[PDB]
Each structure stands twice: as C-alpha cells, then as structure tokens.
Amino acid sequence: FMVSLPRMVYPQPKVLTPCRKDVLVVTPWLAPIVWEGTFNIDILNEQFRLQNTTIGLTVFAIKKYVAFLKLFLETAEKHFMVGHRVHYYVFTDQPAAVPRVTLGTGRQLSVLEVERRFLSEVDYLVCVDVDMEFRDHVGVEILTPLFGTLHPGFYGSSREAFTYERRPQSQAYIPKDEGDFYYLGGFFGGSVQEVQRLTRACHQAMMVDQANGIEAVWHDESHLNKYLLRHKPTKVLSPEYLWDQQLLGWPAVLRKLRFTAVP
Template sequence: MDTCRVPEVPRMIYPKAQLLKPTRTDVLVTTPWLAPIIWDGTFDSAILDMQFRNTTIGLTVFAIKKYVVFLKLFLETAEKYFMVGHKVIYYIFTDRPADIPHVPLQEGRQVVVLKVRNYTRWQDVCLHRMEMISNFSEQRFLHEVDYLVCLDVDMKFSDHVGVEILSSLFGTLHPGFFAADRQAFTYERRPLSQAYIPRDEGDFYYIGAFFGGSVLEVHRLTKACHQAMMVDKANHIEAVWHDESHLNKYLLYHKPTKVLSPEYLWDERMLRRPPFVRKLRYVAVPKNHQAIRN
C-alpha cells in the first residue's frame, strides 16, 4: 500500500463527527507531535476498514522453545478479534515447526512458519528478535505485506484489534507506566549503553510486546535496534530491558506516527483496571515465567 496516497472511500452512511463534542475528554488523544493516541471511542471502524480494504497485514510472533505452548490460544483469539475481514499472514518464528498447532483460519489468512535457531538464554532470544525481524523484512516481508505488527506470543486477544492501529510507525504505551513521570520510566540509564536515555528526556514508556508499522519503517527500527545491541555486546553490556530498552531509545528520536493506548496491552493479574480503560483488547495469559523460560 502506498501510504503517501490518500485512500479512496466509497459512499458510506455514518454519524457525523461533532466538532464541539469530542468523543473523549478524560484521556490524552494526541501527542505533542500530533500523533493520535488510540482509545475506544476515538475512531470509526467502518470508515477505517474501507480505507484499508486492500491492505495485507503481517503479524510476527516468536514461539521459541516452550513458548510454542501459547500458540494455539494466540491464533484462535487472533482469528476472532485481529484484523477481522482483512488479509493477514501470521509469520511464526520457531525452532519447533512440528509443534505448530493447526487452527482453522478465515478466508484470505495464512500461517507461514519460519524456522530459526534457539538460544540458551531467554534474554538472547529477546536480543536476536530484532535481528530476525530485520532480516526477514528485507528478504520477504517487503514483498508480501504492507504493514507489520510485532507481538509477544504469551498473550491472547480479548476484543477488537483492527486497522485503527496501522500507521507508518506505532508503539504501545506500557500499562504499568502510562501515568508515571518520565523519571520513573525504567529506561536504560547507563551512559555506556546505546539504549541510554537521560532522566530529563522521554515522552512515554513503550512496551516491547506490541509495535509495528509499514514494513519499511519496521525494518529501519529493527535494524537500528539490532546494530545498537551489537555495539552493547562488544562493550560487554546488556540494556536493562534488552530489546525493549532499545525500542524506547529508537521511538524517542524517531517519533511514532500513532500511539496505542494501554487498551492494546494489559495484564489483569498485575494491574487494576481504571475506568478510562474501557476495553482490554490484548491481555497477558497466566504463566510461570521461570518454568517457561528455563
């Protein structure tokens, strides 16, 4: 999809927006650089579905080692809630192709299994995720899809996640930090690291489990993060939150064109849901982190 072109929309009947009656006044809906922050009530799905009607979306997910156990629920709920009515390619990175579950898919959707190596430490999987997305973006994603959505697999969809998220580059607000001051963000604070962010800088804290954009922009992001991590490795340092730390550094200096609210990633076991978070669209599933990662 040529994102520089204004999409044509056929004749449609829908309620007129009221300029003097904003749909949300309880939350910030625009960043200081004029990127929309996506909350329930801030968009019309019917209009957006028509704008993106000829778009193919790629979804990348990593099911390395024991994490393959999460795939069945992930795919089943994605088929119910993710980009319904649109063409989707699920790109599953795994070291266990034989263990990929068979899940019935809607018309125009497919699963592509990409066999990759595993790593001794789960931290190394995080560190090499950006490299793998970058490499495959160049090799095939650029030729097969218009947008990439990069997600963690140990989650499930629980409500609509559609084309309202699509933009040149988007990040998702971390549910644990959306109301925090920048000094409280768990950025990498050691100047030696390429992910270093000073305490007087920072817009938001973005979670590494949900980001994306056009294939070209995702390629630029993942390549830059991988290169930065390789510099850190040569200097014998790992950023405090691995690829998430480098993602936050990148999005600080390459402002996202859309920001997803905490509706798009939530952990009901860890966080109390405030009233302004009207929907929980993508949520963590119960797990024993030590057992899964070991």
C-alpha cells in the same frame, strides 16, 4: 492512488465536543493515541480495504512458548484484522509443534524455523509477544508508518519513573529529563520499511553495547524506547492494546481490554 470512499451514513463528528475528556488522544507531534471512542472503524475499514491491505503478524515461539500458540492464533482469528488479509509468521525452533489452527478466508500462516520476503508479502508488520490472547477488536485503527504501545505499568507515570536504560555507556541511554512515553517491547509495528529500519537500528545498537560489555536493563525494550524517542511514532496505541488484568485489574479509563497477558 486512493479510490473514493462510497456514501456512508454515520454520526457527524462534533467539533465542540471532545472525543475523550479523560485521556490524551494526540501526541505533541500530532500522532493520534488510539483509545476506544476516538475512531469510527467503519470509515477506517473502508479506507484500508480499498487499498487491499495485507497485515503480517509476527511471533516468536521458542522452547516452552510453543504452548501459547493455540490460544494466541485462535483468538487472533476472532479479533485481529478480521475482514482484511492477514499473514501470520511463526518463528520457532519446533516446527512440528505448531498447532493446526483453522483460519478464515484470506488469512495464511507460515512457519519459519530458527527480510525482502516481508517487503513483497505484506504492507504492514505487527510484532507481538506470543504468551498473550486477543479479547477484543484489534484492527486497522493501529496501522500507520510506525507505532509503539504504551506499557500498562507506566502510562500514568512521570518520565523520571520510566525504567529506561540510565547508563550513559549504553546506546539505549535516556537521561531523566528526556522521554515522551514508556513503550512496550511486546507490541510495535508499522510499514515493513519502518519496522525493518527500527529492528536494524536496534540490532546494531545492541551489538555496540555487547562489544562494550554492557546489556540494557530491559534489553530489546530499552533499545525500542530509545529509537521511538529519536524517531517519533506516527501513532501510539493506548494500554487497551496490551494489558494484564491479573496484575492491573480493569480501570475505568479502559473501555476495552483488547490484547492481554495469559495467567
């Protein structure tokens, strides 16, 4: 049951005025593609807060990657789901090496040394790489049953150029005439149920490949792409959500650089 929104004053949407004229804002299966200018964050914040939404953010920090945790967490505190309940899950082989980061109210962090837990603790799961930093708003506009993020190096490429696994012997195989987009393995998510279904599917597919003596060209990312090809995401995040300014600069098409690789 969703309670009614309160009175709100904002610009009236204009039916005869495109949101963006430079980019695709909706997929062929009617899933929005999230770009700056397509959403009113005040309306979305209201909708998700009225549901007391809790977002889980998972990251793996093994070996030398634990060094990226401080900046990652500090910047997440300034830009990730601010105003909403957030539960960070840091999977690491060095529990004592996790930095003591100060968190805002309603936000918590759990250190797990290296699934029903997620089902009872959070509503949505967001899975990202740790060698990154938030530089701008990353909020509830991304929440949906299942979402993928456009790889910054292939958003303008033809499917032929996508680095999908091209060997038929692999479970991640995708032929040259198939494919919608090339999604990043480093930023995906959705409801706990959908995220677990995806990881369960990929885990099994990778086991089959291993038994068959084959490893997908881009590992988990290759399997992720096969999954999202066969199970269309309900939202697709633009490259604003995972960019590399050092290698790609700052194109006009990107009004904001929200989550980026650390040099």
